[PDB]
Every structure is written in C-alpha cells, then in structure tokens.
Structure 1
Amino acid sequence: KQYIISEELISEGKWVKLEKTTYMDPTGKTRTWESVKRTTRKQTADGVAVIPVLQRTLHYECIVLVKQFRPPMGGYCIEFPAGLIDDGETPEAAALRELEEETGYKGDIAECSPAVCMDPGLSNCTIHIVTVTINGDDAENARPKPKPGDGEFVEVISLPKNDLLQRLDALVAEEHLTVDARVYSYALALKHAN
C-alpha cells in the first residue's frame, strides 16, 4: 500500500550518500524522508556480522567480540566481527574471512540469516548475521593470527556466553565503551530465554 515515488540526491560522498525519498503514505498523501545509502553496491546484503561461538573443552563457551575506535561515534565500540561482503563473495565466505582478518580465528559456518536491516529508519543497509563456531582446541586456533587490512585496529574480547550481558554491562561501567545494539540484543535474549 506504501511505495517509493522518487529519490533526490542531496549529497554523495565517497562512501555514503544522503537522499530525499518521496513516498506515498497509506492515505494517498505524498511524504518525504531523508535517507542514507552506501554509494555503490552489486550482493544479497552489503554485509555480514559474525556471531563467533568459541568452543573449548572444559571451558565456558565464549562469544568473540571486537573493540575498535569508531570515528562516527568518537569513541571505542564493542561489536560482533563484521565487514563488507566483496563482489563475488558468498555471505558465508565473507563471514569466515572477516572473522579471520579481525580475530585470527578460523571457523565453521553454523547458520546464516536472511538480509536484515541495520537501521531501516535511516539507511538501507542490510547484513547477514552468520553464526560461526570456532573449535578452540584445534591447532589452527591455538595462537590465532589476526590479519587486519589497512586502517583496521582491532582488539579481540572473548566473553562467556552464559554471563554475556553482565560482562558487557561491566565493560561499559569501567572502560567507557559503547556496546553495539545487536550484541546487546543477543545478550539480553540469552538472559531472557526460558
């Protein structure tokens, strides 16, 4: 019943553009929205976020997260490993590659979401969330070698899955970091389950 009529370019940078979207509301009234989009895209989604479940025998299962300076936030953020899917990459292979570049861990695909929206009220950005298990007892994940690209500076933070929410709240309280909303949502639901 609602649909897009027209999009006007307001401003196009190298990575990000701003548009004025004209749309028809359900009453038949024409309305405008300021929208952000990535400047270029081919793929199912722009991206993947990886939920990396570090499994080591006789240890608590851990969720592997990353801490990086985020210039739009002006500070440090705790996030699932994540990056853009390359032209030609499957979401799954983008997931293993990012996880390896960012954390040094080599993992196994467990499941892969459909494309899900990051911030549908601002952007059109979408990602696949990819659940990956990491056999922490395997020799390749003994001394994980993080292979960061140019301009990535990633700190790795493993937290126990059974206390994730309390551990993140502790990090926020003491380290003045911002936790990512997907990470927090995941952590909440681990507590809210049954």
Structure 2
Amino acid sequence: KQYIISEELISEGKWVKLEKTTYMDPTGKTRTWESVKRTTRKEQTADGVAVIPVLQRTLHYECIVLVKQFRPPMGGYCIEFPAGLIDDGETPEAAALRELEEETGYKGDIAECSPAVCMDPGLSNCTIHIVTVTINGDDAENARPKPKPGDGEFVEVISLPKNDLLQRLDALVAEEHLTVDARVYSYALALKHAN
C-alpha cells in the first residue's frame, strides 16, 4: 500500500550513513524520512546476531549469559546479549557460536535461530538474527570460560538466573550508570510474565 520512491544519500561514514527516503503513503501523497543505515552489510541475511546463551548445569537453575561493555554512542556501559556483525559467507548460526566463544569463552550448541528482526525500524534498517544457544556448564571445557587472549576488546561476562532475570537486571541498573539492552529487558519481562 506504501512504496519506496527513492533513497538519497545525505551523509556518509565508514560504518554508518544517513539517507533521505522518499516514499508514497496510502493516499498517494509523497512523504520523506531521514533513515540510518550501516555501510557494512551486503550479502548476509542481516547486519548481525544477538545470542541468547542458556547456561545449563546439573546443580543450578538455568542462567542467561550476558555481557557488559562500554558503548561510545551511549557514553556509558550497557548490559546486552553477546552480539556481533556477521561475516561474509558466514551463517547466522556460525556467527552466533563464534561471537559467543570470543566474548565469553563458552562453547555452545545451536538451539534455534530467528528470522531477521529489526532493531529500531523508525530510525534504521538494522536487523539481526536472534540465536538461542545452549551451553553445557558441567562439561569440563566450559568450567574455565576464558575469551581468547586477543579476542578483541574489554568485555565482562555476567550470568543471571532465568527465574529472576528482570529483578537482577533492575538491581544492576540502579547502581548505576548501566543501561540494559531493550531486547534483553523484553526477554526478561516475558520470563516474568510467564512465571
């Protein structure tokens, strides 16, 4: 019912570009929108993956493995699912498994992989696949979770019980300069709403 008429570059960077989008509304009227896009994506099904890593251990409730890291655009630290861009020819599932190991040291198994879902559709065309990954936390390999020496940057791992995720996220945000990711928080809400 509505159709893209054209997309004009406004400004460019090495990773992000601002565009102006002309589209037709249902009435027939031309309208415009300022849209953000990454310059990085090309062939992949989506820009990246977010990983929902379910840490399963015989003596414990299931935990969700999250990472905390400084996020320049936020000018602060954020708590998020492990996530990253997907590489070329690399499948979402593979990107997820790699990204998880690199950021946390855990070796997981694919449980499921979502279609491409949007991050902030009013602002950008950015999409990811949400990949659920189980981790056997009793396996000796996952006893000593340590990222590869030169994985990349400064990431802290934080595991939280599934049965209390929302409360535990709220606690961390309170003290203080931490922002929880919106997908993490939405996941935590459903966990609570389903008890």
TM-score normalised over the length of structure 2: 0.96
Cα separation, 2, equivalents of 1:175 and 1:35: 32
Offset, 1:41: 2.0
Cα offset, 1:40, TM superposition: 3.2
1:1-194 equivalent positions in 2, closer than 5 A: 1-42=1-42, 43-147=44-148, 152-193=153-194
**1:86 CA drift (Å):** 0.3
Cα pair 1:101 1:148 within 8 Å, conserved = no
Q: Residue by residue, what CA displacement relative to the aligned partner does 1:140-166 show, whole Å, maximum 9, x if unpaired?
A: 101012137675210000000000000
Figure out how many residues of one structure are paired with residues of the other and give that number: 194
Q: Are the counterparts in 1 of residues 103 and 151 from structure 2 also a CA contact under 8 Å?
A: no
CA contact (8 A) 2:102 2:151 kept: no
Unaligned residue ranges in structure 1 (runs of 5+): none
For 1:71 and 1:31, the matched residues in 2 are separated by 33
User: Residue by residue, what CA displacement relative to the aligned partner does 1:155-194 show, whole Å, maximum 9, x if unpaired?
Assistant: 0000000000000000011232000000000000001116
- Cα separation, 2, equivalents of 1:101 and 1:18: 31
State the shift of 1:122 in Å.
0.7
Q: What is the CA–CA distance in structure 1 between the aligned matches of 2:135 and 2:49, rounded to whole Å?
A: 17
Instruction: Assess, with a 3 A threshold, how the Cα gap between structure 1 residues 148 and 112 changes in structure 2: closer, same or farther.
Output: farther
| Alignment CA distance shift 1:151-1:99 (3 Å) | closer
Cα distance in 2, alignment partners of residues 65 and 88 from structure 1: 26
Q: How far apart are the structure 2 equivalents of 1:138 and 1:175?
A: 34
Preserved CA contact (<8 Å) 2:22 2:31: yes
Distance change in 2, residues 1:11/1:151 (3 Å): farther
Query: How far, CA to CA, are the matches of 2:65 and 2:172 in structure 1?
Result: 14
> Deviations 1:29-48 (Å, cap 9, x if unpaired)?
00000000011322111110
CA contact (8 A) 1:101 1:149 kept: no
User: 1-side partners of 2:149 and 2:2: how far apart?
Assistant: 43
Aligned-pair CA distance for 1:136: 0.2
SS state at 2:74 partner: coil
Given that 1:86 and 1:94 are in contact with CA atoms closer than 8 Å, whether structure 2 keeps it comes out as yes
Residues 165 and 191, structure 1, Cα contact 8 Å, conserved in 2 = yes
* Identity fraction in percent: 100
List runs of 5+ in structure 2 lacking aligned partners: none
Whether the 8 Å contact between 2:40 and 2:47 is mirrored in structure 1 is no
Deviating more after overlay: 74-83 vs 171-180: 171-180
C-alpha separation between the residues in 1 aligned to 2:18 and 2:59? 50
The answer on whether the counterparts of 1:78 and 1:179 sit within 8 Å (CA) in structure 2 is yes
Tell me the SS of whatever aligns to 1:113: strand
Between the aligned partners of 1:159 and 1:92, the Cα distance in structure 2 is: 23
Tell me the CA shift for residue 55 of structure 1. 0.5
Change (3 A) 1:67 1:171: same
SS for the counterpart of 1:151 is coil
